[PDB]
């Protein structure tokens, strides 16, 4: 990993010295740098050994001498394919932008502000202080991606009181991170694993992490930032948001909640149970109220992510496997649906949803692919999302199956409204006022669709290569939770 | 059963959107709450100029 780690930063910076009004070169070379960092992510996958509690390719550089809070970079188990999904998806955003001129949307600026692999950092960052810096850090890139080239639906903004609470929750986690950091000098995640805290304080520290996380996670009391953040997000800002920025909260719980505070997690199991359950119920019923397509997909994403939560709780190896594989399948499916709804916007240039009609005439291949992914967002058994969600379900393994009975409503209403909305979008010869402008999909368009469908099917028919490469790590996490 | 679903959908809209408005109204009120306390204390502070 030593050299092949910093591909996106090197690429971005050495392209910053190429303003190059003639876009062809910046597009080509940024895309090549992204694709080669993805290639090195994938060869790093191939490099994996599914047999160690240690982290696969550890590296560091002194960051502050005393207590050495340094860039500790591990990729065991989950992070392995989290960074893989990150890379998998970043060329997708670079490729959804072969727009010809791309002038006001200055192409090199979006290249340089999507080609920041701080997501790679955080998923490999294995000392929760610097790990803290990155999800909060990616907000500066996310904010510029969300509105600079993002569609303007309102005076671009986020609920100000909610945003203040969201960042306050993030900084509340920071106080908890410091309390553990000075609690026993424990710099990094290996030693924060080894150490043992006061049960009276483990619960406080757990909920303090949980503040920021359950903001990043879309739980019922605070999740509103996803719809408002997406309906304004650009086509490639949503692909990243759904893809990774939601995985942030669940991976945070996975690494720095379950094997960190085993007693606090034991104590708060019913809390997250009910939270995620009622969140899934709400976000299943809501798309009744929401007619906005981006809000629809964002709420389906909330549902899936709170399923990821209702599964990560468990010492069930199947439980957390279903959690992380619902994460992978979600970063595939919701991002593929955001790709879909972005194509559906642009090809129609309209931001009402009642206006997407006669799709089987305009773009019938888009109808086929939109089904190929909406069956997934409802988790058709056979798809990747099915393996994910059902290992989430069997996560009631040592349990007594009372939260699966709330996932009942959460997923039945989800699949129901998934089908309702796929109909509502493709229904009828509802002639729109587009002046016979059909907008058939592009070869590059079906290309950027290719990898999501491929990952989806390759998981849904063969989840081994992902459950393997993971079981050793998750099982170590579980025994530390034992 | 369909009478049940209609009455239950109406009640569901009621409960959920009611608590939604409850949240939002609590936020709206609790803003100017601190605003006006802070301004009253600052008003004492600026009457210190000419007490």
């Amino acid at each position: 990993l030593s050299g092949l780690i910093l591909c996106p930063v090197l690429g971005s910076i050495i392209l910053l010295f190429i303003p190059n009004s003639r876009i062809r070169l910046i597009r080509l070379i940024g895309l090549c740098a992204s694709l080669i960092t993805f290639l090195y992510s994938l060869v790093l996958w191939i490099q994996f050994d599914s047999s160690t509690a240690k982290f696969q390719f550890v590296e560091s550089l002194r960051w502050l001498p005393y207590e050495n809070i340094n860039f500790y970079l591990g990729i065991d188990g989950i992070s392995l394919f989290f960074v893989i999904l990150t890379t998998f998806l970043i060329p997708i955003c670079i490729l959804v932008g072969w727009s010809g001129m791309r002038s006001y949307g200055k192409e090199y600026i979006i290249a340089f502000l999507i080609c920041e692999f701080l997501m790679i950092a955080v998923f490999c960052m294995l000392d929760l202080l610097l790990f803290y810096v990155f999800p909060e850090s990616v907000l500066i890139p996310m904010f510029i991606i969300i509105g600079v080239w993002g569609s303007r639906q309102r005076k671009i903004k986020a609920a100000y009181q909610f945003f203040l609470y969201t960042l306050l929750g993030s900084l509340f986690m920071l106080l908890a991170i410091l309390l553990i950091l000075f609690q026993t000098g424990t710099t990094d995640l290996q030693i924060l694993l080894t150490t043992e805290f006061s049960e009276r304080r483990q619960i406080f520290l757990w909920i303090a992490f949980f503040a920021s996380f359950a903001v990043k996670v879309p739980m019922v009391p605070v999740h509103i930032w996803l719809p408002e953040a997406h309906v304004e997000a650009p086509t490639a800002g949503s692909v990243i948001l759904a893809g990774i920025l939601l995985k942030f909260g669940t991976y945070g719980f996975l690494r720095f909640s379950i094997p960190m505070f085993p007693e606090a997690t034991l104590c708060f199991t019913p809390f997250i149970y009910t939270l995620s359950a009622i969140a899934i119920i709400y976000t299943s019923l809501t798309t009744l109220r929401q007619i906005d397509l981006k809000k629809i997909i964002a709420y389906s994403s909330v549902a899936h992510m709170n399923l990821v939560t209702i599964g990560m709780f468990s010492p069930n190896i199947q439980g957390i496997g279903g959690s992380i594989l619902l994460m992978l399948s979600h970063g595939l499916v919701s991002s593929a649906l955001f790709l879909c709804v972005g194509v559906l916007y642009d090809r129609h240039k309209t931001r009402l949803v009642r206006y997407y009609g006669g799709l089987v005439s305009t773009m019938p291949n888009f109808s086929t692919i939109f089904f190929s992914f909406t069956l997934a967002n409802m988790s058709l058994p056979g798809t990747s999302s099915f393996i994910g969600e059902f290992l989430i379900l069997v996560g009631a393994f040592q349990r007594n199956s009372l939260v699966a009975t709330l996932a009942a409503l959460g997923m039945i209403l989800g699949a129901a409204y998934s089908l309702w909305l796929y109909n509502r979008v493709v229904s009828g010869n509802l002639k729109p006022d587009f002046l016979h402008k059909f907008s058939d999909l592009n070869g590059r368009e079906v290309f950027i669709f290719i990898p999501f469908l491929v990952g989806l099917v390759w998981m849904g028919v063969y989840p081994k290569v992902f459950l393997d490469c993971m079981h050793t790590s998750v099982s170590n996490l579980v025994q530390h939770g034992k | 059963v369909l009478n049940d679903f209609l009455v239950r959908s109406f009640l569901r809209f009621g409960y959920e959107v009611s608590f939604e408005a409850l949240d939002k109204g609590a936020i709206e009120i609790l803003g100017p709450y601190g605003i006006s306390y802070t301004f009253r204390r600052l008003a004492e502070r600026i009457s210190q100029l000419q007490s």
Binding site: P270, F271, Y273, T274, A277, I278, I281, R399, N400, L402, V403, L406 | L11, R12, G14, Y15, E16, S18, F19
Partner: peptide, 23 residues
């Protein structure tokens, strides 16, 4: 109703607790 689900959710939690008391 929303507060009803909020309290019945922790009631299902308590049901898990009663199952824990079953053994």
């Amino acid at each position: 109703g929303i507060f009803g689900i909020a309290l019945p959710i922790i009631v299902y939690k308590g049901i898990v607790k009663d199952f824990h008391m079953q053994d």
